Amino acid sequence: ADKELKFLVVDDFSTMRRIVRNLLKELGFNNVEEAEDGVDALNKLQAGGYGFVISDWDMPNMDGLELLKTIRADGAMSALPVLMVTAKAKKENIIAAAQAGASGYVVKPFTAATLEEKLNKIFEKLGM
Ligand SMILES: [Mn+2]
Questions:
Q1: What's the 2 CA to ligand 1 centre distance in angstroms?
Q2: CA of 125 to the centre of ligand 1 (A)
Q3: Which residues pair with 72 in a beta bridge?
Q4: Which CATH superfamily is domain 1-128 in?
């Protein structure tokens, strides 16, 4: 929490976005915006200031893999961390996300304790 980061939480289910935002609040991260799919996420990211993305995978309009690829291709935002979120209903194409440079993976639903452990692993390995 003594880390100043603006998060973007992306999920097409409003209920899950709110859960994740509230978990972040429990961890002391109070600057957290939501987006409902990858297209919406672009509009947020282009406004600037974001430091970490937590993105669902399967979404209407633009999915999380396409979002990840678009971020990684961007000359300013190419290193933005992206934690990919998958659901138990379907195992996603992890090989493609690994190829594209996902920062990590987590299966929803999860608690704040799990999220914290995941975030800290990413902070440590990327050096932020
Ligand atoms: Mn989804």
A1: 31
A2: 27
A3: none
A4: Response regulator (3.40.50.2300)
CA of 86 from ligand 1 middle (Å) equals 8
Tokens of 101: 């440079």
What is the layout of strands, in order, in the sheet containing 32-35? Answer: 32-35, 7-10, 52-56, 82-87, 104-108
Ligand 1 centroid to residue 57 C-alpha, Å: 6
**Strands 82-87 vs 52-56: parallel, antiparallel or unpaired:** parallel
Which experiment gave this structure? X-ray
The neighbouring-strand residues paired with 85 are: 56, 106
Tell me how far the alpha carbon of residue 4 lies from the centroid of ligand 1, in angstroms: 28
Amino acid residing at 105: Y
**What is the C-alpha separation between 78 and 92, in angstroms, rounded?**
22
Closest CA to 59 of 78, 34, 25: 34
